[PDB]
Amino acid sequence: KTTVPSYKPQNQWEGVYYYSGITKRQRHLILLHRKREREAHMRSFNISRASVLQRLEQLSGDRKQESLPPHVRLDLAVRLAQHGLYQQATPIVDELHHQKALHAGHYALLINALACPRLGQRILHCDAQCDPALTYKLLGDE
Amino acid sequence: ELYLRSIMDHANTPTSEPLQSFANINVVEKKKVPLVLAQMDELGVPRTHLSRVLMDEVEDSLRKFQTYRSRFYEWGRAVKQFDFIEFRRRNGWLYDLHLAVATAEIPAFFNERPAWERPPLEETLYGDIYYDSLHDRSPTWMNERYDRLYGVNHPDIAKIGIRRHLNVEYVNRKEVVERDAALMKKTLSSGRRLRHRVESS
Amino acid sequence: SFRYTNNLIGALKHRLLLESSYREIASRKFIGNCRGVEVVCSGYGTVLAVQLT
Amino acid sequence: TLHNQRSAAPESSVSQSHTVNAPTVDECEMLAERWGTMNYWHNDTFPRLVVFLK
Amino acid sequence: QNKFDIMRREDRLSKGEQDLTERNTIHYGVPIQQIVDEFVFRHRNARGER
Amino acid sequence: TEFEKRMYDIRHWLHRQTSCEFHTIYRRNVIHDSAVFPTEHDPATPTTHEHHRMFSFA
Amino acid sequence: RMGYIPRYTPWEWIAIQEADQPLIAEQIRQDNIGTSYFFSLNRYWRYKA
Amino acid sequence: ANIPRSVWDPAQHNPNWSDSYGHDITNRRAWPARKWTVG
Amino acid sequence: PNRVGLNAATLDCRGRIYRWLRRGPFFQVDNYFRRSVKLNRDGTLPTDFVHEAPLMRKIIRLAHRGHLKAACEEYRRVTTVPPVEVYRALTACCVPGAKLADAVSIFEDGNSKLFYVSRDGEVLHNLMRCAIAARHRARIMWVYNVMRGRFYENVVVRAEVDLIWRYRIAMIALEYLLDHECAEEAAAIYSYLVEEELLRCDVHVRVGLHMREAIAAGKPITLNDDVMNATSLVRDATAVAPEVARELQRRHA
Amino acid sequence: SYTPNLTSLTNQVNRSERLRKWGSVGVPPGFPRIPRLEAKGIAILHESPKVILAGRSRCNNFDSNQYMLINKATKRCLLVDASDDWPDDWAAFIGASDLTLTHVFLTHCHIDNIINLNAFLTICGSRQKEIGVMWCPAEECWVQNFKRSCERYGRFEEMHQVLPMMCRSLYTPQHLVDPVHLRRNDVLLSAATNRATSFIDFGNGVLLYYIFSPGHSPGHMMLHIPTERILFSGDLLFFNKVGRVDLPWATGVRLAESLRLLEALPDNTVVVPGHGRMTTLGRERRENEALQQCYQRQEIGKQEVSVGFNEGYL
Amino acid sequence: VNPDTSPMHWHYNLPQGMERPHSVNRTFAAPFQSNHSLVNKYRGVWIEFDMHPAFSVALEPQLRKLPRGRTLPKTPAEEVIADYTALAPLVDDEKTRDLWLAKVFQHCAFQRCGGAMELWERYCHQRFTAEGATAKPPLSLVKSVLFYCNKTDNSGWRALFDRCLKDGWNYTPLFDTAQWSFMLKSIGRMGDEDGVRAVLEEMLDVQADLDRVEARSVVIALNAVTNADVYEFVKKYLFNFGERKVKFLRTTYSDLRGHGAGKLRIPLKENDNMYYHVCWHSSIRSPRQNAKIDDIVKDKIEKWKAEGLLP
Amino acid sequence: IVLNEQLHTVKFFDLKIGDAIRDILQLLQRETGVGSSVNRDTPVGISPNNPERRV
Amino acid sequence: ASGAPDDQVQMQTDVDANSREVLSARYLFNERRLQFCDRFQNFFQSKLENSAASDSNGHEKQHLFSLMEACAVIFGCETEAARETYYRMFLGLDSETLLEEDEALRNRIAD
Ligand SMILES: [Zn+2]
Secondary structure (H helix, E strand, O other): OEOOOOOOOOOOOOOOOOOOOOOHHHHHHHHHHHHHHHHHHHHHHHHHHHHHHHHHHHHHHHOOOOOOOHHHHHHHHHHHHHOOOHHHHHHHHHHHHHHOOOOHHHHHHHHHHOOOHHHHHHHHHHOOOOOHHHHHHHHOOO | OHHHHHHHHHHHOOEOOHHHOOOOHHHHHHHHHHHHHHHHHHHOOOOOOOOHHHHHHHHHHHHHOOEOHHHHHOOOOHHHHHHHHHHHHHOOOOOOOOOOHHHHOOOEEOOOOOOOOOOOHHHHHOOOOOOOOOOOOOOOOOOOOOOOOOOOOOOOOOOOOHHHHHHHOOOOHHHHHHHHHHHHHHHHHHHHHHHHHHHHO | OOHHHHHHHHHHHHHHHHHHHHHHHHHOOEEEEEOOEEEEEOOOOOEEEEEEO | OOEOOOOOOOOOOOOOOOOOOOOOHHHHHOHHHOOOOHHHHOOOOOOHHHHHHO | OOHHHHHHHHHHHHHOOOOOOHHHOEOEOOOHHHHHHHHHHHOHHHOOOO | OHHHHHHHHHHHOOOOOOOOOOOOOOOOOOOOOOOOOOOOOOOOOOOOHHHHOOOOOO | OOOOOOOOOOHHHHHHHHHOOOOEHHHHOOOOOOOOOOOOOOOOOOOOO | OOOOHHHHOHHHOOOOOOOOOHHHHHHHOOOOOOOOOOO | OOOOOOOOOOOOOHHHHHHHHHOOOOOHHHHHHHHHOOOOOOOOOOOOOOOOHHHHHHHHHHHHHOOHHHHHHHHOOOOOOOOHHHHHHHHHHHHHHOOHHHHHHHHHHHHOOOOOOOOOHHHHHHHHHHHHHHOOHHHHHHHHHHHHOOHHHHHHOOOOOOHHHHHHHHHHHHHHHHHOOOHHHHHHHHHHHHHHOOOOHHHHHHHHHHHHHHHHHOOOEOOOHHHHHOOHHHHHHHHHHHHHHHHHHHHHO | OOOOOHHHHHOHHHHHHHHHHHOOOOOOOOOOOOOHHHOOOOEEEEEOOOOEEEEEOOOOOOOEOEEEEEOOOOOEEEEOOOOOOOHHHHHHHHHHHOOEEEEEEOOOOOHHHHOOHHHHHHHHHHHHOOOEEEEOHHHHHHHHOHHHHHHHHOOOOOOOOOOHHHOOEOOOOOOOEOOOOOEOOOEEOOOOOOOOOOOEEEEOOEEEEEEEOOOOOOOOEEEEEOOOOEEEOOOOEOOOOEOEOOOOOOOHHHHHHHHHOOOOOOOOOEEEOOEOOOEEHHHHHHHOHHHHHHHHHHHHOOOOOOOOEOOOOO | OOOEOOOOOOOOOOOOOOOOOOOOOOOOOOOOOOOOOOOOOOOOOOOOOOOOHHHHHHOHHHHOOOOOOOOOOOOOHHHHHHHHHHHOOOEOOHHHHHHHHHHHHHHHHHHOOOOHHHHHHHHHHHHHOOOOOOOOOOHHHHHHHHHHHHHOOOOHHHHHHHHHOOOOOOOHHHOOHHHHHHHHHHHHHHOOHHHHHHHHHHHHHHOOOHHHOOHHHHHHHHHOOOOHHHHHHHHHHHHHOOHHHHHHHHHHHHHHHOHHHHHOOOOOOOOHHHHHHHHHHHHHHOOOOOHHHHHHHHHHHHHHHHHOOOO | OHHHHHHHHHOOHHHHHHHHHHHHHHHHOOOOOOOOOOOOOOOOOOOOOOOOOOO | OOOOOOOOOOEEEEEOOOOOOEEEEEEEEOHHHHHHHHHHHHHHHHHHHHHOOOOOOOOOOOOOHHHHHHHHHHHHOOEHHHHHHHHHHOOOOOHHHHHHHHHHHHHHHHO
């Protein structure tokens, strides 16, 4: 039962040979470029977050006894919640509410900024692989 | 983005084991990517406003299922196809996927005897309906030869033999059967002549 | 190959990041308010003060 | 081994445009703003024009 | 991989529905034409049943 | 266009030694731009048969 | 069974054959612009009409 | 989709579809001629 | 100059006769085109051809005079790659008639078949003007997508549009879309503008013109927030701001 | 030809030879079946008071001759080789002549001789209703390699057909079937062919003397008729040639000895080869240069003399 | 014998259905590989230009005389040199000044005017290459200066490349295949064997397209090899190229040594050792179409003396 | 259950011999030297996991 | 080859020359062996399918296929010598092998 290891009609059900697909090097270069873009987006988000936290600290150091107008505090709290620093913004919204400077539009503005749009953008471009469906899933853990 | 990502997810989904006998059937679903791209071009949605990952996958699908007329007119030259063959031989280990069993391993009936001796089984095999006019006399004379092997009914001609293969000749059936009939006529006549000579001698 | 070296690079990066985050948690201001009773505390857990706005 | 995919019966071949059902409260509410064929307004069983007048 | 997906899976199982992970592959089961032809073939025309 | 694709893809599994060709008759919108193709009064000096002579088309 | 040759090509075979080959770009046939009355027939000589 | 739902979906199965052997067996069926007394 | 001209072989050997019988549909034309026309070693186009130079000057003159049909007839005779000015003038004479079909045909003829000679900021600006005149929303987006381009054109071919031309094209497109209340498309173009950080480019251009005057004078040059705010545009917009805000208040009410 | 081992697959000279011998197609076209459109009829080559001979010349594409002896007294026919591509013509011939086919005398078991043995036996036995096979047991080597030659020459239909000589004859232990196949008539010839006893009695006092003549095949057997001066040599002595030696188990020296085994037969002995035209032993002695060399080397004193053809066997 | 397993026209009465589907293209995804080169490719050294629009439109009357994308004005390099010398100090933005200097370097390279290293020394040298300095020049300026040096071949390429290595600016992983080909061509013409070794090693480390380099440039860089150690380095390095790249290298070197010797600006020098070794390597890649011994010797000689065979 | 799994490997000894011999053949048909620069992902002369992977 | 008509059974083999995959490895059976295989498989399908989910096993699965065919070849034989030869080819365990093992065990019990 031993075998034998071998190897004008034309097969009409065999398709023509054509060049489909990429090279190993091209795939590696695609990976490299996507990784560089991911680094660029992470660097942008980190720089912006650091700048906003620096602004928060400078403003707090200035406001040890002086109270700033409500609008600058509203903007800073909105930016903090936008960058995901919600716990840093609870005091600002609490004092604005106690002072009764917030209104219908401002409350909705703060609750919307609380969804972390900038952090969501960073997650989308970096960790969610630009998947809008997975961005929501990845934002929920934070 | 969402629709194209759904297309890619469907294409990448593997299929049941029995249907995975030949290839990943769902890859065909990437062939609609150019269709959706043309629909976007007509709807005014720019394709540059797509994620880099989705664009990588879209370009993969395009290079898989798309060619232009200029490419097509040269698509099939012996030079390109033989380059494909030689490249497969040189590097199949880098790009070939191969580099279920009971489907190909199943006992099969075997015709032990030759074809002429045993007619092969596969060869032996080969008004308004709803409101029900039988034999309307269908005049076929108002509007407008076969040949057998000559040995169908003869006690001397063996019923079985290699001459049965002549039954599946079409282009020159008339001439081949005429020659066969002449040969059998001559052989029978010579055999009878020998019988008479042997008896008389 | 270089499995331990790569894993140690990753672990050191992780722990460096956590220590950096600790340096900010300790320095940060943590205020808890209930019915006007504002408790100001550090990242350690030390009650910096108990005031009432 | 029925399947793992979802199942849906074949989509009805009865022309929903030509078939007219019983009136619904919101349809009657919006009747002053709705359009319809003379068949719709003089349906043998659901005279939407009579409803609109009433 | 996602806590979101794990929570979805457990919630859907508690509600008593098909899990979205079971759909990660496509399984067209044996069609009724296949089953009926198999039955008639095994039963030799199913003369008793016709 | 999905049906056109699935129809064109038949030649790949067509039967043995059988060929196929496709005829498509589809409705298409054509504009008659009256600006590029206007209606004008017949010129003062009308064309004669000399302007439609042999090799006149060129 | 024996000598069974299918009378219809299975869907799996059809899908394989359809995936094995590409598409032709012009088959889509989109004409949202209009017809060029001045240049389409005076294009470059290499790809001229 | 690629494979139409009517093939695999049990809900869309055609009730009037018949098996692949009975019709051909019936066609191969040979009915003896109606034997009358005279004709 | 005196060496332009291509010689041809002969079909004497049986092997070459079989080659000729097996040649593809476009063999003489394709081989002649690729032998005559090629990119230069320095990357410059083969545009500069002495024999065809007066013909291309005639094309430019006819296109500027507005004889589009005569210009196309003359372009039909071109054997080499025409200069980018030819496409610029053709699209310029196409703009006034709003013949987007002819403009797009010209751009396509020059874009992929001739080394992207026609992929120019001014050519695409004229295409965008044609689309604006035609009020063709889909082609407005098509032109914007084309000027954005792909990897093949931006990196491999290195035929990309300049930042100023990108700004001008996107500005006119967004102006038309906002005037005609195309919310999604105006949003897409504005998203591209913010991605490109191209919002204050008009003020940057004005500052650049003033810097050019200062250079012609001999004066030093710098770019700063005070320089940007010293321009009439920003000061006047900020002065008009309160009126716009109260007008939005009225309209929202 | 031979199994494609790893060396046969990794050798470049094999591919060079494949390209050169058979052009751009690397496979040989083999020898196909002659179409019925171009088949001759059986001719009567000899009429004698005791026996007669009837044959066909170009039976195969191998150009092999088919012969049959008819005893004329016992009405017994005997095919020499099973080489005819169209055995049913012979079947009808014997049916019309009212003869009884008793034996098939395989001179040797090469493919050109054994290609149609099963078809001959089936057709002739069907008309009869057993038919024996007379062959030299030395050629089990060729019998068991019958498949290989069929695969090489493209005679696939006859490939999967067990030869009748392999079916447990009387010299082999018989089967022990469960209480819930034998060939009795076939005979095996011995290599010790004597001029006195080694023969078969065809009947009516005609004795067919078989002669062991190896060199072309290990178990080659000629047939001799020392009453009508007829010699069925077969792949041994042709009109102007001799058997080949380029084959497995083919030896030039033993071929030369087999040739020398013909030094005493009368000159007017007509030799009917297995291929080609009929010649006579005198002409072969007088005009055959292979035989002339076989004897000239012996004259000048070659101790181990070898002769044989290397280009084509008729 | 040992039996073999039996392996497997078409009549018109048969169904004429296709026996089996075939999927060759989906099983083997062959990358596009053509003998002809890309016709739309930019066969030149691209230097990215991202000048801020305000400064660009301020310097338009000066930059119009410089080479833009796929544009090479034939203005004399001296007028551009004067424009830069006069104006660059006037503007006070380091990045736009660096970009302008890089464009001037590219213009000088293409015009073969030489002496732009003088400008490098005047402005760029002190901040980056003069001594220990953390300032990192823009990659555009680095590319332009290396391209200018390679075209108007000068010895500063080694000093600048050394800083471009990893322990420094680490820009060498960002150079293109064309820039590598030009560097190798210039190094080969100037005849720096150790420089060729350094460039080849750094290229192999940065993973550039070894087989997409200009064949003439690789060939010149190889002919510029005479030292034994770098000769063995090349002997080992030749295996990195593709099997079809090595054959084209041999053909190009043979052609340049023979007929096409005139297509070079400077005649190629004779290295028959390189020619022989490259031919041997191409043929190889293509198809086929001791104290103890001294002790033994002295012992045997002593014995023979004993036998007297050696009087 | 145990016997069935054993008998399924027994009949494939010759086929695995053939598969091995065929694997040797495809080995001898691949490109000579080290992998060409185009079909290569990892860097040559360096482990792909080397911490000094990039320049 | 001599064998017996019902004893000698051959194997059909076919392997791809590019993907190096076995596209055919089967036995050439007669009607009796094929009918035995059909009885075996239909009897096991009537219960193994109902008892087994076949979530990953598959619907067309052949249960104990190797044992079934190795038993079918022997079932189709007509001679004890041939049946024992096929037994030995099947993991040994023929009459002589089992008797030799029994002999070894009986010699080891004495020790
Ligand atoms: Zn012979």
